[PDB]
Amino acid sequence: GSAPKYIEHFSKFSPSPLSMKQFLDFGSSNACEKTSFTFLRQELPVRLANIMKEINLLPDRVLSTPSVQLVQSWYVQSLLDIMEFLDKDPEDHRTLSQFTDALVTIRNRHNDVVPTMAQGVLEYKDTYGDDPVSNQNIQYFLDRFYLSRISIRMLINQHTLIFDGKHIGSIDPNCNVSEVVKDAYDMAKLLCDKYYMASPDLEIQEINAANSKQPIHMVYVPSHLYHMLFELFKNAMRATVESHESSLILPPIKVMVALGEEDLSIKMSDRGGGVPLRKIERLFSYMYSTAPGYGLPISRLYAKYFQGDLQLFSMEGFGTDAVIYLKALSTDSVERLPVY
Amino acid sequence: GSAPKYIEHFSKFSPSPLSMKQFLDFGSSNACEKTSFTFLRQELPVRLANIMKEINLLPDRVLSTPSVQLVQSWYVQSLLDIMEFLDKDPEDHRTLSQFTDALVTIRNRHNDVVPTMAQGVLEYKDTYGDDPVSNQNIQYFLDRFYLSRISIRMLINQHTLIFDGKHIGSIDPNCNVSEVVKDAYDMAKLLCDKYYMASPDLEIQEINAANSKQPIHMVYVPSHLYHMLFELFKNAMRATVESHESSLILPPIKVMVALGEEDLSIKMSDRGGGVPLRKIERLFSYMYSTAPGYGLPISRLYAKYFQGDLQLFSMEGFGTDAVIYLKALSTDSVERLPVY
Numbered sequence: 001g002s003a004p005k006y007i008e009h010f011s012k013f014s015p016s017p018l019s020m021k022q023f024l025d026f027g028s029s030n031a032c033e034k035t036s037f038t039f040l041r042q043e044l045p046v047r048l049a050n051i052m053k054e055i056n057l058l059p060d061r062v063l064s065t066p067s068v069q070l071v072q073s074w075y076v077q078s079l080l081d082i083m084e085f086l087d088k089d090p091e092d093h094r095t096l097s098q099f100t101d102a103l104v105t106i107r108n109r110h111n112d113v114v115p116t117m118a119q120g121v122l123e124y125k126d127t128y129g130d131d132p133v134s135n136q137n138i139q140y141f142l143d144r145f146y147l148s149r150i151s152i153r154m155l156i157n158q159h160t161l162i163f164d165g166k167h168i169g170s171i172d173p174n175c176n177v178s179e180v181v182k183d184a185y186d187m188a189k190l191l192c193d194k195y196y197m198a199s200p201d202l203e204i205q206e207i208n209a210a211n212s213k214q215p216i217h218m219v220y221v222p223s224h225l226y227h228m229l230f231e232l233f234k235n236a237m238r239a240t241v242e243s244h245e246s247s248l249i250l251p252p253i254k255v256m257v258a259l260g261e262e263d264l265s266i267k268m269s270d271r272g273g274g275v276p277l278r279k280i281e282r283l284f285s286y287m288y289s290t291a292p293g294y295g296l297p298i299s300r301l302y303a304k305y306f307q308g309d310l311q312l313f314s315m316e317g318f319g320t321d322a323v324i325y326l327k328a329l330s331t332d333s334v335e336r337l338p339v340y
Numbered sequence: 341g342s343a344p345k346y347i348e349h350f351s352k353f354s355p356s357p358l359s360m361k362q363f364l365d366f367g368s369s370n371a372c373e374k375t376s377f378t379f380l381r382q383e384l385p386v387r388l389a390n391i392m393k394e395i396n397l398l399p400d401r402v403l404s405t406p407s408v409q410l411v412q413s414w415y416v417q418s419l420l421d422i423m424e425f426l427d428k429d430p431e432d433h434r435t436l437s438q439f440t441d442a443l444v445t446i447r448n449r450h451n452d453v454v455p456t457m458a459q460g461v462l463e464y465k466d467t468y469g470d471d472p473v474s475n476q477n478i479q480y481f482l483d484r485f486y487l488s489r490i491s492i493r494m495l496i497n498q499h500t501l502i503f504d505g506k507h508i509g510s511i512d513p514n515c516n517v518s519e520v521v522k523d524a525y526d527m528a529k530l531l532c533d534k535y536y537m538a539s540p541d542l543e544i545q546e547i548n549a550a551n552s553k554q555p556i557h558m559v560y561v562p563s564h565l566y567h568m569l570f571e572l573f574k575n576a577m578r579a580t581v582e583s584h585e586s587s588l589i590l591p592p593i594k595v596m597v598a599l600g601e602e603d604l605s606i607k608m609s610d611r612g613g614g615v616p617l618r619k620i621e622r623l624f625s626y627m628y629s630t631a632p633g634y635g636l637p638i639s640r641l642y643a644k645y646f647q648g649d650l651q652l653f654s655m656e657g658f659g660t661d662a663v664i665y666l667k668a669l670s671t672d673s674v675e676r677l678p679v680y
């Protein structure tokens with residue numbers, strides 16, 4: 001049993017956040033597999049150890065619960081799996097293939113962590129209550145835990161996608177934002193029609209300030225952008241349809257994509273009746289969003305992961321706006337990791 | 341010299357926040373002058389003492405500066421002026437008249453406190469720097485100091501306006517929000533034309549969710565609402581005109597007034613080119629807004645004073661939205677005072 005020793009050792013290192021350029025360089029060609037392996041066999045234990053150390057610092061009433069113990073056991077095994085490759089020779093192609101297989105196993109091992117943590121939150125509410133102090137501590141920990149998870153899965157996805165034997169792994173250097181908006185809308189519309197037998201239309205407007213006629217493209221991870229937009233579309237469609245049940249006119253959902261000098265901003269606007277300001281905060285709360293999902297708080301973490309943000313503003317009695325803020329320039333797109 | 345003794349004694353009491361109903365009851369008729377006098381001769385020393393105690397807890401490098409010493413001297417004299425009436429008989433009409441005169445003198449004595457504090461902020465930046473920690477401490481203190489000042493001047497205005505010998509002092513029980521919007525726009529337009537020789541048009545839309553055809557009215561302090569809207573209009577017009585200097589089309593400023601079950605929300609929208617998210621926070625910072633004004637941070641305090649808020653969201657390359665959040669119901673409209 002060396003896991004506590006491993007956690008203590010690697011938690012002494014700070015994680016190394018990567019920029020988009022570094023991600024592109026790692027994924028530029030298959031010749032970089034050895035470089036990716038040498039980087040990851042060190043970086044992954046550092047990122048795993050730092051969050052694992054924070055987990056062990058949780059109060060005993062949280063640490064001893066089955067959900068936390070289960071998740072911690074997954075992290076311990078994944079940490080130990082990566083340790084086997086520290087002494088292995090990068091020049092051996094068998095080492096590289098085994099490392100890629102190990103990463104896929106690690107990724108699959110953690111697939112259910114989000115619902116597992118949600119179960120823990122519900123247990124905490126029923127076992128100790130839902131006071132504001134508990135909400136803040138849970139919010140602080142889960143935001144960091146999930147942001148850490150996003151960063152680790154990003155590293156694993158880039159290695160496995162690229163070194164399997166235009167797009168650079170999960171990164172699209174020429175991501176057309178409006179196309180991703182349409183994809184997320186279409187998926188949300190399909191679910192909306194199945195459940196409600198009615199769906200708002202989509203209106204997309206683009207504002208390219210520097211080049212008015214040019215479609216807006218960026219370097220980004222389209223799956224992350226899809227996840228944020230899909231979650232927002234689901235909320236906007238549900239609100240729009242339900243608030244107009246006794247009405248015939250169904251207002252469309254309006255999306256504006258704006259490209260500025262440093263911001264690429266996406267605003268989604270509905271006329272779904274709005275939310276009082278008092279209730280806005282609870283929409284992003286893990287504790288208050290638990291009931292006997294976490295789409296919005298996690299969506300905000302995806303936005304923050306590359307130095308962006310996700311903000312919500314409503315007008316009760318009318319409708320709601322959500323804005324995804326992203327960095328327009330790849331030079332400004334850098335991993336945001338929990339501060340340890 | 342009893343000022344330190346007075347500060348210590350009355351700082352042991354919590355301020356008593358008043359609701360709109362209590363304000364209306366105090367101002368209902370001239371027969372309440374004695375009740376207002378008995379309440380205020382106690383409440384004003386409590387509110388003055390609490391902020392004065394916080395001032396004395398500032399670090400010596402701030403406390404000893406001429407600006408803080410000047411403001412503190414004004415507070416000491418105003419506190420001493422109110423003390424004279426503690427032992428006086430409310431039944432004597434001369435006591436009531438003298439008390440009203442004393443309040444007017446106190447109000448005038450503090451007229452220049454905002455520019456005086458701004459001078460102190462500039463001195464601090466030049467004498468010690470503009471680090472983030474200094475900005476946060478200055479922001480924390482000034483928000484509380486100015487909110488305290490707003491609450492004290494509200495109490496003084498209600499007494500002096502009503503007991504001078506539809507509207508209840510500075511409170512309009514039937515404030516038409518759109519009329520105040522138009523007034524603030526018209527004033528901002530007049531200044532805009534003088535300086536720029538061009539001004540955006542105004543478009544007001546009202547959404548009365550419960551009663552679609554009814555104009556939106558509320559119980560509020562129209563001067564406070566005017567101050568917020570006027571500051572927002574000035575920023576929106578400046579941005580709109582300057583960003584379209586080399587253009588012929590001048591987009592209008594759009595205002596939506598929405599009345600919900602508990603929120604009355606006012607959104608102002610411009611197409612003034614927007615602000616990057618990174619720079620939004622500095623717009624509300626006293627330290628970063630100082631240069632060799634404070635309209636936005638103080639405007640937000642006016643919104644917060646009766647349990648509201650003022651939020652800003654921009655889309656760089658396009659334009660900016662500001663939303664004033666107010667409580668729709670007088671029962672929910674209660675003074676928000678600094679927590680001591």
Ligand SMILES: Cc1ccc2c(n1)[nH]c1c(C3CC3)cccc12
Pocket residue numbers: 232233235236239268269270272273274275283296312320321322
């Ligand atoms: C009534 C209601 C409740 C929650 C939400 C809502 N409307 N719209 C939402 C949106 C729209 C894209 C802007 C996003 C997230 C939650 C809500």
Ligand SMILES: Cc1ccc2c(n1)[nH]c1c(C3CC3)cccc12
Pocket residue numbers: 572573575576579608609610612613614615623636652660661662
């Ligand atoms: C370019 C720029 C800078 C600052 C502001 C701006 N536009 N609009 C503003 C507004 C509009 C009502 C929404 C308010 C406050 C500051 C700004």
Ligand SMILES: [Cl-]
Pocket residue numbers: 110113149
């Ligand atoms: Cl995980």
Ligand SMILES: [Cl-]
Pocket residue numbers: 450453489
């Ligand atoms: Cl003052």
